[model samples]
Target: EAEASKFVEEYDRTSQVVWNEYAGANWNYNTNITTETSKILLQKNMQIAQHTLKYGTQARKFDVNQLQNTTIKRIIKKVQDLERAALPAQELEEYNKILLDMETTYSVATVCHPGSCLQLEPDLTNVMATSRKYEDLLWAWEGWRDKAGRAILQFYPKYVELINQAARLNGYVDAGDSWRSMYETPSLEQDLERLFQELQPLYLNLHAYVRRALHRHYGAQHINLEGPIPAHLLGNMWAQTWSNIYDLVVPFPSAPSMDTTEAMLKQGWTPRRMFKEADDFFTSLGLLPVPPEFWQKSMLEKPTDGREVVCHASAWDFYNGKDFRIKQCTTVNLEDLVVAHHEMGHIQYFMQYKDLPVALREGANPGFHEAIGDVLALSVSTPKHLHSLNLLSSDEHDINFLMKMALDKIAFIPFSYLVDQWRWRVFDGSITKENYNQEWWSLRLKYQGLCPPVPRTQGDFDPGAKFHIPSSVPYIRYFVSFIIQFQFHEALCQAAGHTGPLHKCDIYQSKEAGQRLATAMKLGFSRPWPEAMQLITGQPQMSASAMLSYFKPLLDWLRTENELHGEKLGW
Candidate 1:
């Protein structure tokens, strides 16, 4: 009977609630009490929880084989539909142990000075993002790449081996192959490879421009076309997105800076007000008001009583459908305002699909989940939206506004791709122990046009510096997210009768757009990603054209500026 699968699903839900509640509370307020507790409890909870579900799926006697598929639903159903095999009592206790250990370890590596990130306030991002001195950035980056990961690297290889072994046991070539195969798209890996190939030319043009500009601003010593820009100079801890320091390279320096953060601060905005503003936009779009539970239940900011917390923003659906929350240490500004919209998009998706079967609960794919949020964010972050919020003058959508959005979203496209590009190599065993660090920077230079702040040897585990690497979060979600968000926005804009450049289109209050998006959001993973995407946008393959259209104003200018400066497109 289907009793086993049903039991597993309910068990999965209860255990997930326990884990997220424990982990999320600790993440919201990471004092000593919460820290040790989360690791111990979370590790134990995850092993017992996932193993039951994973074991049920694999161990069940089945007549047909669909284990290779990305979804546990199909994998579960094909087993339920057919009949064969002994009960798989397989356990992944050690792997779950490694997962929790690495999660805790990576959190320490990035946020804390040593021992535990929980030991202190983890505002390291403020230090990393705002610093101008190379020494400060260097020291910060060093701790990230080298200072803390010695412990992690010891266990990393074994983690990789066991992960790959488990993956193969599940009938996958490796973890990354299964990760990619989860996409409903036909030939997911091939499509990703082709997507990156299409992305290269645009990235090359961007890289060369940033190089020349930084070279002028920092001089040849800090910036050189022959090598990557120093990793810290790119306005982020990891230099992942260069727009932070775009003031140094802006095509027009005299253009007035948009200081929405400062302006919002003057108005004394709080985290609640910011989320309320975001809620208003969705309401205008005809999405129902943010659920009452959200206002009552969520943690919006670091506690005022000096409780240490992880300030990174995230949306959480603790149950398969019902309870939704966003955990963030909110700021009063343009950035957070836009991010608030992004997070709420996830909430809206949850509201739409709360009734779906547990088996059908997931993004069309992970990227699609991320894209839905960013899709709304793109609309809200538009100059038109900002102007409506009284944050900007109606200057008719000029380059200054255009460039900031491009830097945050567009420039992030390759950085997102590069993370998975590196990880997939690690997943496939193409990246070995000896060349891990070397290959990391090689890919950085090859794809991102950046390098370490100082000369690095094999001893430097720079890629470990990125939190995603140690935490084992998939990077492609972000990469594909930045691309498809615009595609989603373009569809909504056209529904709103946007008649100009696609990039310039905004869909802030369009009920038609809301209705269109709601139809697709309710579909959840019931349909494949291509089918889900096609349902909303009517174009399923995820073209970068909408994004390209959005930045047409910037792209043409980059070309003209490059030619004028005698700056070649490629290094």
Candidate 2:
């Protein structure tokens, strides 16, 4: 334990040095360091950081022995030498080119026990690889940030290069023939698709079950316990449902909608303003204005006295505090509702973490927060909820609405998982950018049974694929969480004494349901996500089977509707 603690201290110190050097370089972009020198420093710092994270993750898994400790020290020294040698280079393009070449070699050399590294030793190799991929991704992101911060930086120059580098590093470019191939095989895709298909029924049924439960609660005049939702409040109800569900399932605050919009704009988003439009729409729905106290408590830093801000992403303020802001974009009728619900989930979790330590405050697991939002969004988008908001007129319409949404949700999981799997492969030198994009579109067709409307032009890749390019490995958690959400819904249904459509009960009104979820939220990351879920749902394991049991009938209803409408079978 003493030895391990010493090593941890050393590791932390070394990591801090690497981080400070890189941050300093980023800050000094226009100062003494020219673009070329800065680029070299940035790349070198990134490589060092990557090596440090990889070594740390690997070393931390094992007890320190004389031989193992010596081995760790040697590797650390080698990485330090490599970074020290690379950091003095001048010229941005030359430095970047050299860095890329070195990374190519490094990635190839880093392969340890080729056949299913994850299977051989989940800790030493697989976990280290996962951690390292995130490190490299973060550095790659910083590379983009460095260029973006400089006013003279050309979009085509560094943007394309960084994108290409990111794709390469993520194994999107690898074409290896190891036990676990870099590229996803048809069998893998099919297996995942089958998993979704098997789970689809449960998801649909869960939706129906929840709707029934909500209706039942309404019938029992218990709706006010959740909160009083106004008539035709589909949008607001959807947003709040997602928010509440996330608060129950995960403790992280929902990502703010306004902040996401602003961030998008900074990345070149342009159109009308979405945040303002959403604010106006919510106001029209009789939603109260964001209270001053809410703003004061939520902001990371206090706002200036005179600045009047009408629109913000809840996640941004909730997660990033005062940095919450957005850019103008044309409003799609349903997009804001979806975004609001999703982000509100993030914010709700954030708010719940007020007393948690900073490190544990956000979604403790990578995909935990993202999944929380999706689950809440899925919960609120149900036909029963829509009908309550006056969006649906009848039970038949409710069933049909529920089916379409369920299929879309189930179909989306594979694509989400693939993006994460592919990015990890890219970091290992398994695939290329062009091929990655091709693979992306191909998988989209295979999984979602849909194709991009336009040809594969530059920057034409699916936006979803790029989400992790900036964020990291947590993206896959959405798929995992999607499955978990259904599991949660199943538990909710069983608790409510209904097996069919959940729409019959007003879940919001049910204090019992709220208490069940609130208890889960309070557990936070003290337990593993699956364990936490099981404890809350009284389920033995996390599986789509539990959820699929509920969604099957709803899918059938949707299939019948599709036949009647003469619509194609696949979305």
Candidate 3:
């Protein structure tokens, strides 16, 4: 016990040092996004990962039963959990280098059309969000795949090979198995399958309705009435969320617009103002406000001084717990307003668990971390909450508002699942390198009812165009979070004494609800995820029932509307 105690104490001391160094380096790189910053981060990551492997390997020598203290046992296991770090120094360095290279390629990539080359952000991203022309969408889609997706082909194969190799060294079947092991749920795949199966009918109905709507906008020559929707026409570059095309599929066009952008603009909202409103919501719930250091250090808006910043929004934990910040190139809009709440959810979580040991300073599961911000954002975006902020004129539960939220929320479930699905298949050797694009399309068609805008040859790597594939981030957390956020929302609303429909229940200023949320967040990963889940939700396992409950009104309305239009329900 003394030996184990000594080892864990040392591990905690050393791990914090390396973690701080790595976080600082990464923050520098993300804020500047220069080659020099990238190199510094790569070196720091390689160094820290080496330390993790060493301690993780050493931690395996002591059994959990032998550990003297509860916190000590949990801390040691957390260190021991990431078995993928069990590689030798050279291989670990190679793995880190490959990750850095892939991310750099993604960051600097641009699409060209003979005379014009454009980056993904405001240029192509705006094109995807607003373009009504089928040809224009097709052009951006093809160009993006050629630049971002096809370009990463060189790195992805070796990336997969190295990951699988590391997993084997750790006595796992493959990288997929290693990733799934983190949940400590023996039936991880079964749970996912159960959730997806339960939710598939809703997605199918949504797909059919959206397809029929697209058919009306773009003639039969462009959109098929009975088949998969064109990937490019769905408003998102990836079509993961279709809310951008709400104008095309809105059931009532003449109803008061649910969009709060015009109101926000009219009220002279800035990015900081948006985040302050979000912070105010949390404080109203009796949760901790973001530390003053957060305002001093966070990059809340784009740098106007000609520095290239990766404008992707992310929340950061400095490992010291006191320093939490978000790096977002936020615009003054309703979407970013919701995002502000989402990002602050992460900060609130960090504050709640700040005193825990470094190893236990994560979500109960990866999904919990993701669900925190989104669950709050779910309430923040509700008609009641927005009306309270004076962002919306009325709090009358609008079907169009629910429909728009469904398009954003319900449409994303399958895409999030299928990204890792394709990766897991690839890791297991069922999907070969030669068939990467083919298998990606197969899953997209089967799950999302989406097909490429242009005919895709085997030469093209469509998955690479998306950030997570080459970045090698596991995506199932997103799928899990999307469903569980509703679970959380339900639990919080119940705690807030809400008695109405799920969508209308906003726990904005409910101190009881905030207490429930804080209780869960404060647990961090000290116990099993199920225990943490049960603490807040009284449910030991994740369920999609709450998600379905939130969208029940829309589902019923869709069924009746689809039947009236003679639209088939499933693809």
Candidate 4:
């Protein structure tokens, strides 16, 4: 035990330098050397994993219950759990090659016209979001699936086989089982089933109302009232959130609109100012201020120089503790304002746990990391918070505000859950290569009530068009985040001594809420996730009760509207 502790102490110190180097490479992603440097760093990481697995194997022989320091036992278990899937050298090389091929296929894919080709980001994405023309949206959506999704078809089968093999090597049933085990919950599948059931009614209500609205906007020739809404018309490439079509589905168009983006523009807000406002919100809660290095080094906006950079918003911790930064091509608007708060939530968590052992320096669970930022974003989106910042005129919450929030939040619940549901079945061999696209759409239709913008065939690989599928990122974390962020907000609001409906409570300027939140962040992954969950929420189980509570008003309003329109609640 003493020997293991000494090794762990040394491992934490060395791991930080190794991780920081990798993080630095990702931060400079568009550079020529970044990919090569990342590969070299990954090799170093595999060596460390091999070494840790040796200690983990030896520790397994010990009577773990008799160990003096349980944390050492925990460290040993986590290492084993993570590293047991280590493949033989040949298989490992093949596995990595397949992963890279899949990612590259997705990244470099472009839809070409008769004379010109267009990338997904600024080209098709803009059309999907803003174009009201039905045929234009369909063209972009179908072109993307034909290009990126079909291009990955050749690699998908081998990729699945290698991942399942790795999972079996670790004693998991399949890769899906391996992914779910990370949460330290045995009944994750059943929990997801129950949570989905709990949330489905709200989803159906919103779906029916939106379908009716779309039918009016585009007519029955383009929009179907009895069947699923066309995928491309939902204002997103994936239709995960329908907020962009808020103009079509809004219940009362004449009601005072809360368009804070207009006010923010008129007030001359810049990208830096948006981030500063997020930093200020955290400080108001008595949390640590943005470290000096954060301000100096973060990529707050797109560089005007002709350098190409990935514009996805992400937060990074250098693992050296104080050098946290965000790499976001931020814009000055209400959406970016909320996103700024979300990214800084990550920075706050990074600061809180900076001194922890490197192995323990992650979210209690994958869902928790995603949920923390979203919890802060939820509060920041509240009318009270925006009004306090002078970005909104009315501090009063209304149904229209709830409607927009639901469009982004409630609308996303089923899609998040179903993305991985299809993959899990695929990993377990229930959905084979022959039926891959078939099963993907079946799950989409079953859960999201969405279908292909046009007809799909087995030859197409629609799932791969979405980045996460080809990238092999586990998506249930997002589903779990959507539910628990509300739970977190509800608890933090209580900690702040706020008295109101769950939707309206904001935790700003509350030292108690900040301290409570800080305590959970400091736990990192040292303890099991349930302990951290209990520490902040007083409930070890992740439940949808708080989420349902937050959306109750919208649900009731939707019920009335759906009935008035004679809309069936579910497909």
Better of 2 and 4 by TM-score: 4
On lDDT, the leading prediction is 3
Query: Tell me, what's the RMSD of every candidate?
Result: 4.4, 17.0, 1.9, 2.6
Prediction 1 TM-score vs. true? 0.87
> lDDT of all predictions, in order shown?
0.68, 0.40, 0.85, 0.81
lDDT of 4 by residue, 383-479 (tens): 7788887877722237888888999998889999999999999999999999999898888889989878788976799998998888788999999
Scored by TM-score, the top model is: 3
For model 3, what is the alpha-carbon lDDT of residue 276?
Answer: 91
- Better by lDDT, candidate 3 or 2: 3
Ranking by lDDT: 3, 4, 1, 2
- Model 2, range 1-571, lDDT digits (tens) per residue? 4555465456655554565455444333312224465466666655655655464454545543443454344333322322212222333344355433332221222122324221111122223222323233233222222222121222223333443443343333321112122112335345445667775444333333332333343343422222222111111111112222211112112321223323444545322232333333323323323334443333222124523221223353323222222211123223345565556445445544434322234443434565544444554565455444433334444444444454345435555655555554554445455465566555544443333323454443333213233222234556656666666666655564655654343233334444555555554444445555666578534466755554555666645543453432333
lDDT of residue 210 for candidate 2:
32
Q: Tell me model 4's lDDT, rounded to 2 decimals.
A: 0.81
Candidate 4 off by > 4 Å:
30-66, 82-85, 115-117, 303-308, 394-397
Q: Which pairs of residues have clashing backbones in candidate 1? A: 59-88, 62-83, 62-84, 63-82, 63-83, 503-550
- Alpha-carbon runs more than 4 Å astray in model 3: 65-71, 81-85, 113-116, 394-397
